[model samples]
Target chain A: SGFRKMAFPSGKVEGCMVQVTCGTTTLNGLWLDDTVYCPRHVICTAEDMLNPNYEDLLIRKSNHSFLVQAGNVQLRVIGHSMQNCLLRLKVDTSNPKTPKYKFVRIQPGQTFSVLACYNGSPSGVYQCAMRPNHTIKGSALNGSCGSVGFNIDYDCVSFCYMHHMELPTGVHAGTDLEGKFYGPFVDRQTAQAAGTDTTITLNVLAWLYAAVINGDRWFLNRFTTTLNDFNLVAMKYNYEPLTQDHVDILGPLSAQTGIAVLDMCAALKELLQNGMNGRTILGSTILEDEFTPFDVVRQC
Target chain B: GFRKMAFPSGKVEGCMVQVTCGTTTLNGLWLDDTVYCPRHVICTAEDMLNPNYEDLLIRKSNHSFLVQAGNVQLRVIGHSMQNCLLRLKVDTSNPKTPKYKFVRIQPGQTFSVLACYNGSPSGVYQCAMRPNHTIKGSALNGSCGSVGFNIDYDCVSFCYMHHMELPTGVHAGTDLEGKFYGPFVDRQTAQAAGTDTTITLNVLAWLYAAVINGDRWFLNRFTTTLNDFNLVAMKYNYEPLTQDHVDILGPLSAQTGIAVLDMCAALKELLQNGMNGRTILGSTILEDEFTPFDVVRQC
Candidate 1:
């Protein structure tokens, strides 16, 4: 019957968190220059709601009585379509409580009328869905507006909880019995992390370099060379002893790095891995190979 | 470090559910034959120490047991390399334990052991990976081995409440995170559905019938003439729905049901949709058309 809401703070399964919301035009008071501001918000129904980019709109309520130092506001208008609609901007109202100039509206656009309420509350980030094509845009007169207060063009949503229901064994989702609902797979952490690409990127880099340098070497290593050095770096960060798995990669790296060695063939022979469980030697493979015969005689 | 447990019974995601064993031949056990017959009722890492797939293995410590009434009994030796693995099976295990055996080896041809554990446990789907090419097939006595598993031989994945904290989100998924770890794009779905000729024929039934049932109009539909529908049907069943995406399908029973597109939510997100809309005259949910879902209202 209704869309489920996302759990706040820590989002649980079958939910979403508020990304954010910022400034707008017209209904929200501060875009008061000369630029044409679209409606501050967009309003729609279940059948026709639109999520417009607030960044695209820059109109503020331009009127009198309302004295907001900075920031924007939210409002809503009802009854008629945008064509038959009238938007008001109220600011600096000492003599006339409702004394203010009228708010502007772009033709063929549907927006909410500002309510005179909701003055001086933390008008920070909020979420709203509005009408398509006809949206609030551009800058408006630097002033305040008050109609009924949060005159949200379209009613915005707040934090919602998880919609997924925990179920017993083999119970299919949607087959809720009594008060119990069934959620077949409820891997919230994995589900959210997997869906978020930016988080995933940061995670990968956090593993590569201790700080990841803002997704540096790990990002580069993704397409470039093998992850040997990166893995070593990760292991070092984790304080893991990178011996067996670590040494296994040396053969390949040594093969690539030994073309410039003095005893080229000896260097190659020394580094090449024969099989598993080989002995580890010190002072380079080439040196060990070169001194083996002489060392054997001297020791005898 | 450790293996991922089962995805919990009932809470299975996607169409098919994957199962693996401690030291079994096939990835999944049969309704009849079991790869690991644990002494305990619940399977665990401890039970996998000496994973056995015998009937007697079921109640080694219990007083009762599930009667083995199926056909096949696939046994696999646990190579216990380090973690758990998936054991997918194609042939359903029958009364005789399905008659088969299997072996596992690492990429470099080294034999590794496996621990039998139910998947989705610990609230995670274990992913084990081995080099793609490495193979070490075996049979358990009756010589009836051969089944497909999603997990790689040497590559077993450890389950996290989320994915690994390091290396980035290689396979981060979503609700319908079936195959790709990335976002759903319609183009990708369309391409995958039509990846082969067979899936196209299966999924796009109307196109197939348009040519087959074409009488005077059949020729108009296909460049090729009307020879037979049997070939078409054969190819249709042959091609399965490998990729699940926007599959605009059917007229299954001829004029009985109208054909429409069934796009998963993943595809629907691209349209930036609304709740649900109904058409005026027909009172139907429109599909594949330029109808916007959002029509806002104010206070």
Candidate 2:
């Protein structure tokens, strides 16, 4: 059966009133079903009905009568009174097939749709909520079972995914040197809990390398600010004190040399050694070829 | 019938002297017969008496003359004032008229003449003079100064002309290509003209000189070409040539009989290919990864 039935046989009760609550607000109204009547003298106007403001509402009725329609109501009634009156109301608008899990993996900058259903049928407009700090957008679900779109920004993903997304073949797909350089330092838990300064430095390093390889002059022009911020933040996470050897090796690799790729590699190496000191998933022997990644640097 | 002859004491003032003419025993009279005073004797003393003969004697003074011979101009400087009559003449005398007739000069007077054949300038010349003859029927006698100097024209004027023919309106170091042989009617005209060899030599010389002289136009062009070549090479992951390696091409082309335009075309092609490989100046094949400096050396 599509609907539940209730009956009242109190020998023709007169002047009975029903109380209805939608979400936190309550009002008085008559509960009705097809071809049924409980009070003959009691009259309930449209003003007596409370508008639906929630996915579910509570209802208590004194008697029963013929049912009346309201404009696109979202709240549904539930429970029954002793005299066969409505006792509670509710709105069942959640998508029934949605994954019942706490979290889902979404690619950075990916857009997806969320579908909603009402009472096992796809029909209604409803509003949804998420965590305040969430970077997803588009939270409204529409009628006709149409989907609401949600988009995830790049920064919304976990740090491991942000900095070291890999291909099926295990190649580093991100813009920086590779995933292995970060190793345990950028593991999902550690990176998400990294200090604000450390996160900012890592972001700058990634962006800096991206700008170099892509030849993005507009971003590269701000190199001074970017590098200064990186250096300033990187000091907090240095595993060992900087020494003369580090200075000598890094000094000549600067903007003055007009070789941005080489400069970026030098900075990345320095950051990996000091800021992200840990065992890299890939062995450290690859670092022995200091300029392996910079074959094109000198030609420019 | 001359009876006695009385020569004058010291230097003789004149040919006249006391002599018996036909036994009349004349005094303070000229000797009439050759028996006692020959014609040569009388005429010699009379020739010496005239200062015109003294003009032939060389003196210590400096005098000079310059004469244009063909493209070269011959210049002569007299160290001594030995008077002589100088004139300009042709090697062939089909035309009787010389470029210049005899002009008499003495101490401190400079003689200038043109070395020409019938008024046309000749490059070859000679220093020639004739003695002044004062007495009638006397053998000709004279000397150019005992010591004098001669010099060939330095052709400094030709150098000035070469500079003048250099293209104007286009300043040096600009990318604009100016007229090749500068101010000629056309390339064919410039090539056909006799001045082409000199113009070409001077142009290449100037181009080379520009490098040494640090002319910004030449230096800038070279640097720009080098940098552009490197960028192209880097694009294709090829090795880049050094400055010296690229710089030697201009001189090598000049020495190896390759036209500047030809050299330019070859370099342009090489750059277009991203320096992978190309033939240079039609003769030198540069394979991939070849050394340009060594290739240019072979050229």
Candidate 3:
């Protein structure tokens, strides 16, 4: 009942509606700016900031935890506590007016996963509501404690995904990988002539995969550097730098050793293209193996 | 290139033969039991039905095609050609199978009966195969067998083209050869040409006569045939004729200026002796009114 009409905090400046914190105390005076009025507000002293009330606070606080692992359209949301709740996934997109929203009913101590295109595209960002009893109405979060304001900019990471490729020897940063890695794009007739059993949906998927493969080179450099200890540990194990361990790692490395910085989306696209081509490297083990992001987190 | 060769067209009667293209391979078509299969060619056709491909093309130059037999037609086309696609498209225009003068009965793709009221009163029916029009009905055993022919939750609405009664403008009645008979009515002109306005009406009348004027042998056959046509036609089950009901008809089988006196008695001995009898009689016309057409009209 205390949450009714309460605003949820948002991360983006344009989307932020509710105040993150109701200051140290309420304002009580005149106009500080156009809309800012410093009035009869109880100013919190140093002591109050150090020891504020946790129960009576109305700033729409989040009291649960979650870990998000994502691929192109695939997202794995793991509800970590012994608390069953509905997840209000306010998926932010390129279009400000048309952000996507989804509700995932997650049991306590369970990991929920979805492999669907975001907004029918294949990649995007999201601010998933994780607090207890913050589930949205008609969002399949019924009987679940809690819900959040749609306009609130709850602080969370904006997930970005792209393909990862190993740069060729003697090549540096600016070298286009698409020129060599993905050769000629398969034309409609050529793809059909392959004679393999396929559908138009299947063909369109393959073409989109090629598009990603042919476009991942430019942003691959952003993924350089092994930030947390997971990356450092994975690096020591001789695994690729853009692996899940690298993203979960704590801090950036002094020097970037990996040539291409691939995100989950790009890495997924690259793997898909290779799978479509029946590449030998995509063998049984890597294809069959399933890894939860928790595994990466647990290792660290 | 190393796989196999065959033809796609339906003609070349050998069942198995390769098509000569520009040095390219081909696919073959064989007369499999009921369907046409692309396989090792040179197929046989004795004791089998002829291929029933309606037309070589459907939508103008669209590479899609259509086939029509009797009252049924199928349009087959490929979808998604812009980016890539052989996705076969097979649906139909309206009714499937022939619509004759007595009863135009067709089977819905799902086995539901599609009956037309004002169709021909009597004729040989060639059943149609579903999904595609590949086999001609005349090829089946006892071809054109004596078979004759609904909707909505109400089941008694909408005048289907193949129901019992006539729509506004059509006309029909019986055409007696050796016994009493009836035909379906549709066009207003057809009604003007026919003598009696009710063919299904008299058919049922002959059925009632079979119960008393004749023996159980003729009655049984009549009931069996009537039930068969009325199987999928659930709403048409009107009433039952008792032993005494047709017994009263013994006198009228006399005064009707008909050749067979006491159609009940004469038709009975004929059945008993297995000699010349009213082979087709309106024995079981149960209801006095409410043609099968009226039932389908509300739907």
Candidate 4:
């Protein structure tokens, strides 16, 4: 049910950290200018009752009020006027199933904080939320909770940790799940880099690259041919003494320049190779050389 | 040093991520002929005179630049300074951009072409490389590295496909082979049960390619590249590589640090033992179903 509209209390409310009146609710303080001035602070004003991003909308009770955190997520629960009940905030860390919710009634003004360690989640990322034991009668209560205020910590992830998960095996095709849910394929670093929407796309691409590279090379070659004159792989695989030769070629001033010569070429090698693999998988029936991106845009 | 080449159709196309070189500065980054991140402001007469920007700048009193745009790296040692040519890493990739065309660039030369991205390409483009006013073509004749120029010709040339086409074929008789491949690799056993054992073997097949081909050829057919694989493995769930893969590929991957080999082993292991079918890793909880499993809301 939607919150019945109420008349405004006059002008603007001061110290606006989500206070409720009779009916009218306002989501103030976010996106005021250009920046997300407070990514950690958010409100689920009465207006949020219909469009909650998470499970529950929370308001700050005092100017000193803030979320508590041990690791990635920070969460807190204030109060609802009607019921004095303990509400449990939960998240399914493992991608085993769709998320679930549990609510417990508790005394008012109570504070509790637990480190969101993703203890059982296979995924580094988890969906978290909280809901009330009882419903608010006239008061607004609809929208999703809020941003949990978590940053994708790239440094926190390790190949060893990922290796523990197994990301390198598989013939992932058409955005399949080589790296899905909570596992090493997508970690805090990946979320930090690719965001949510593009995460799968990037991951799928990665798996396909490894799979094709380690796949039937003979079959792959039937479709593709030798890369052009750019020889970045040799440069990287045979670095060291070669770095000196590159310096002589770039210029005399390039000796200690920190310019990524071998590194850039190696990267190019990957891009070219991966592009060709993509072409191979896609160019099954047609002449391998003829399977072009532009043609797909044209006919198939 | 400059050249003046035209976009094949004499018309401008969508933004073609590009790499350019003048007497002093190299703009954008050149990886291959297709993909590149064009990191430069529109060129100006002023930039040529008093250049101010961030790019790989090589100096000999005269300067050149190189860049690491994505995953791999490169090194160039030409035969002579006279061969030191300005190179442009033109991006002919984005199939979505129809107006763009691809063309190759070499030292001391320029040409016209079209630029394309994410769509079909059409239109014209002009580009060129020139000898220095003070430096003669003979003066910089033999640059060490051997770099070639390429152009995005017509449909006959190699073009990338955005969507992976599905294969069609009936299951053939087998000592043990019955399947419909794609994302879902289906196979039947003698007991008439489905198993993913062959999937692990399939992984070994691919991993072998990484070790054998090394860096140069491994990446050839793999357009997305190993970086995405490595990045995802660091971030998400990957198939487990078999112990056989590790026993064989570990030493080689360590020797070269090519991620594909390691990832292959890691994923194979994950597939075999790391998971209970739905999830992998020690602590992460598997998602058995989608979010909002219950369409209706409680309270």
**Which DockQ values do the candidates obtain, in the order shown?**
0.01, 0.00, 0.01, 0.01
**In candidate 3, what are the lDDT values of residues B175-252, reduced to their tens digit?**
111111233221222222232122232233433333332323443222223333333222333222234434444343
lDDT ranking, high to low: 2, 4, 3, 1
For TM-score, the strongest prediction is 1
Off by over 4 Å in 4: A1-60, A66-300, B1-299
Interface RMSD of 3: 34.5
Candidate 2 per-residue lDDT over residues A188-223, each given as its tens digit: 211132112112222233333323443333222323
The digit string of per-residue lDDT tens for model 2 on B63-178 reads 22222222233232322221121222212222212121112222111111111121121111111111110100000000100111111121100000000111211100000111
Per-model TM-score versus the true fold: 0.20, 0.15, 0.14, 0.18
TM-scores, chain A, per candidate: 0.17, 0.22, 0.17, 0.21
Q: Residue A259 deviation, candidate 3, in Å?
A: 82
Judged by whole-model lDDT over C-alpha atoms, candidate 1 comes out at 0.20
For model 4, give the RMSD to the true fold: 27.4
Cα lDDT, all candidates: 0.20, 0.23, 0.21, 0.23
- Regions of candidate 1 where Cα sits further than 4 Å from its true position: A1-12, A15-300, B1-55, B63-201, B205-220, B223-299
User: For every candidate, what is the interface RMSD in angstroms?
Assistant: 23.6, 75.2, 34.5, 31.4
lDDT score of residue A298 within candidate 2: 22
True contacts kept of 3: 0.00
